[PDB]
Symmetry: C5
Subunit: 221 residues, 5 copies
Amino acid sequence: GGDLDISDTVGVSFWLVTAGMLAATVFFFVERDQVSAKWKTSLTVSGLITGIAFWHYLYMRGVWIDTGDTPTVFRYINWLLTVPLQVVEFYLILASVAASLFKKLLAGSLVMLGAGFAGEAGLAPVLPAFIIGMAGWLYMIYELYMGEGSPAVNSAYNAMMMIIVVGWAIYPAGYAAGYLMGVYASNLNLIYNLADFVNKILFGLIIWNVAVKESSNALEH
Amino acid sequence: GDLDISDTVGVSFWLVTAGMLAATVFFFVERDQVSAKWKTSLTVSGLITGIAFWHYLYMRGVWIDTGDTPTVFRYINWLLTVPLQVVEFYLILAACTSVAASLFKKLLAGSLVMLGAGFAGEAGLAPVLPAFIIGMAGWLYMIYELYMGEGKAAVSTASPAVNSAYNAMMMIIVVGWAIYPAGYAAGYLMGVYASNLNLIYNLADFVNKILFGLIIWNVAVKESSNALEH
Amino acid sequence: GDLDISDTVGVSFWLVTAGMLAATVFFFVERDQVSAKWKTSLTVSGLITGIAFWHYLYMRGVWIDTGDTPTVFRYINWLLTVPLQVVEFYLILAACTSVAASLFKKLLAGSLVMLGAGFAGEAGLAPVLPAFIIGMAGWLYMIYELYMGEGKAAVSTASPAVNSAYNAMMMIIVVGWAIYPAGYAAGYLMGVYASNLNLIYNLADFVNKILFGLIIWNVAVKESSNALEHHH
Amino acid sequence: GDLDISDTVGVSFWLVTAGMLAATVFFFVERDQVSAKWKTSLTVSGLITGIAFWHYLYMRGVWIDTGDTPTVFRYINWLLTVPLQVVEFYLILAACTSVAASLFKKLLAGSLVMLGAGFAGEAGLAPVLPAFIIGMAGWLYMIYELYMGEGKTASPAVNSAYNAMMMIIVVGWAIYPAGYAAGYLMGGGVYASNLNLIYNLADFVNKILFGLIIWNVAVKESSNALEH
Amino acid sequence: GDLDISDTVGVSFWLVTAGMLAATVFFFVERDQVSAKWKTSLTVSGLITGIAFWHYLYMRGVWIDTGDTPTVFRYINWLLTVPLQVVEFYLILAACTSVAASLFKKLLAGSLVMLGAGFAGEAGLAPVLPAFIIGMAGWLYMIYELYMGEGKTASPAVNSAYNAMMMIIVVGWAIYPAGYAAGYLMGVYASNLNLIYNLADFVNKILFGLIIWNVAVKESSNALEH
Ligand SMILES: *C/C=C(C)/C=C/C=C(C)/C=C/C1=C(C)CCCC1(C)C
Ligand SMILES: *C/C=C(C)/C=C/C=C(C)/C=C/C1=C(C)CCCC1(C)C
Ligand SMILES: *C/C=C(C)/C=C/C=C(C)/C=C/C1=C(C)CCCC1(C)C
Ligand SMILES: *C/C=C(C)/C=C/C=C(C)/C=C/C1=C(C)CCCC1(C)C
Ligand SMILES: *C/C=C(C)/C=C/C=C(C)/C=C/C1=C(C)CCCC1(C)C
């Protein structure tokens, strides 16, 4: 019944990103009619990612406010549901040898989240778990750069390259800051929240920008 | 607060509820990536996943409040969605043989018996093994009538798309649907293993409601896009 | 807790609540499969199931919380929805005759006499038998106008597809609708059996509101399809 | 608990609430049945009816809960919807007269005097007779400006929509001051039942039915203009 | 109970909440009344009012359970909304200059200094006058960059939407500092503050969003004769 606790920096970013995702989810669904059939399914999936995110952010934030405990299970369940979706996006803008890419990328992301989970969950020591984490991460990055092998599809893929490399780096940076020093619960949750924001929203926005440029270029011809 | 990952059925319920909700949204929104011929399939898919969603919230509620198996919601959900899947089957069958309406009635009859028997088992309104067998009768009657009884009238190869669909519906009613009796056996024919029951029931709905849905959407999008040259 | 299987009236309420939800969605979405001629009819069918949904939620609430028959919720729900079905005749007949509004008025007055007499009986405002009779009178006056009165005049000047719609709709009011007075009869004219009464009413609501919508859906999807072919 | 049929007013709220819900969906969904000329006006018809729905839920809570007139919810709802109604009036004048801009401003001025007055009367901030009389003055001021003053047609739909407007702001709108008379100016305790039953009728007529008329006109012009 | 009318700001919150509910609906629904060209602009417009709506609902529970100014919910709304308003300024700006992305960043920094200052004052994190001066400075730095800095015209709809931006950020936004002045710089006057912030949200989100709607439907209708 009161105002937000400004002293609760973690409750505030939980709030902001909740909203971020809801705005996002709406933006992506409604803007579908400013891209052609070529791009529309991409946009749907962007919306599902941000929308599924939104519901768990609701649920995570309440867990903070009622207990101040880190919502690890809610956080990885969210990632378990959205990462594959982000990876389907890759397959989707390639549909070459794209179904093998999909299967490899998926298995490696499931490894990255299983490793990471086991650590935060106390099912494995914290540093080895991180390493297997990175293994599956870097294994994904490897198959994009080294593995395989229109101008719109290019600028679309390139941006995906960057986000998996540069963007995604915030998450293992978050895991590190929380568990790999001196648990640093606040720092973790801020970096994860910050990571979810950049990666689920900016990713969807890049697709959108490309889709709209292209849908517009094609509409004169 | 946090999900209790020790609650494996707990988690499974959460995952599938999300999948049904996401899939529901995906079937409805994507109606516009397919032609008039396919849109109603998308609607029915979305409806099937929609009803599942609301019943999955309820089913999780009971599992978590009490740790009992939500048999009634489970079977109520099936009662509502199985007929609609059978309708999806009829839609496909109407494209490729002039015997589709008769079949719809038989499938429906099969499906009601399958479910009524199964329910008797779990509700303890009849012994588990006879009930299973009777239910299996219903299931197989459907498979029979579809491929060896009246369904013995010709398929049509005319449309490669409708072939794809026809093949999917087969895979699902033969292979797909087989996951549910697996669940029942595992829960009731060993020596009640509540977890295994629900874990497998939950995987089956995922496969049979979402994955079936997606295969139809794929075929639908592919045929709709090809058509757009001609 | 799990739905109580042993409360079968409760389960029927759940089932129809869901059916109503589902059909509501189905009619609204499916409007993009019909031409401008039929779209509003599907908007109206959607509203019927939509109002029914909301009202089925309170009706169920009531039964499960107290065990009483939601008689006012029921009649109020029918009062809001019956006139929208009747509008449906006006909608599909408005272009091809001027008597559409005359008919409509007649059908409505029939429908209100029918509903009012039923309520009176079930609410204890009149004996159950006399109410049932005046109720039936109302119902039968609707069927008269539909078969051999103003409704017969108005449908002659009409296309095949509007004819297939009209007749299908009329037949649902002859045979489909009979489940309702049957339910009343089951409840109030025997040696009150609330269980049989809410069971049959539930069944009646399920069948009639969905099927009426599906008929209009079916004709329209067919006429609309045919119309895009014979103009291309 | 089943609805209480003896609560006439509480049944009245239930029904109208339900009508507003229905109507909001109707007007929004139906926009694809009208041409660009008419869509926004259907949108405004959904907003009025949508905003009325939410307030009717609240209005009925208050009645069921306390048995008292929900005056503030009533006038707040009217505060939000009446300018929207006056917006729909302006759009119609936009196609007709050549000075819709000024009329709108004047019509908006009347409506606010009207509601202000009405509210003072009911909230007990002013005697109920002068309150009524000032209220009436505002209303009549709007009517004057439409028929005799600054409001003094080359299309059949604009002709129907303009006339629809000219009729409703008199015969339709007249139900409200009637209901206020009924409630405060007959046996001066207050007659809450009559007051609320009559407003509930008036919101019904003026939000839903008048909305159905614009829909009807629009669905006709659009389909006719669809050839050629 | 009936809504409490003695509580003026109480019903001010009620009214504006509702305006945002309605305007959100207006702007999405009316997208089919404008061309691709304007569609995104309206989306950003409903987003602004949608977020606001959800925040006002919360703001109003706070005023009512406690009678306290909901400073946190308010500035949290602005943090979400203002950047979104600045992206609408960028789309308008891209159409009438080569320099629009450099402007988006300067205006966004401008706007965050504007908001953090104000918050610091209201939150009690910093004396109320020097935060006001710093906050003004972020605003005026935006106005500087637009008028007489790196902002120095195409079709008549682009010029309309341009001019609306140039007016709102001067006269429209001005209503916000006026409220803070009214509340913290006179002798905390919490009613006038909240009444004026409510009016400012109404003008700059609903009214300004409405101006853009207007430009877009006309231009969308004109261009349609070809
Ligand atoms: C929508 C969420 C996304 C795209 C999440 C991506 C998360 C990662 C790439 C996490 C990576 C991690 C490591 C590479 C090492 C340790 C465990 C992590 C999970 C946090
Ligand atoms: C959406 C739900 C669907 C398509 C469910 C299908 C369920 C079955 C095919 C269940 C079959 C069963 C048997 C064949 C044996 C006895 C009872 C069963 C229900 C588990
Ligand atoms: C959507 C609901 C509908 C169309 C309900 C229709 C109900 C009737 C036609 C009821 C008829 C009755 C009689 C003819 C006898 C008196 C009692 C009845 C009301 C249930
Ligand atoms: C959607 C509601 C509308 C368009 C309501 C209109 C209400 C009025 C025009 C009420 C008028 C009254 C007077 C003219 C006399 C004083 C009392 C009244 C306010 C109720
Ligand atoms: C949707 C909300 C908007 C556009 C809010 C804008 C708010 C401002 C421009 C506030 C400005 C202020 C100053 C310029 C001085 C410092 C204190 C203020 C923050 C309230």
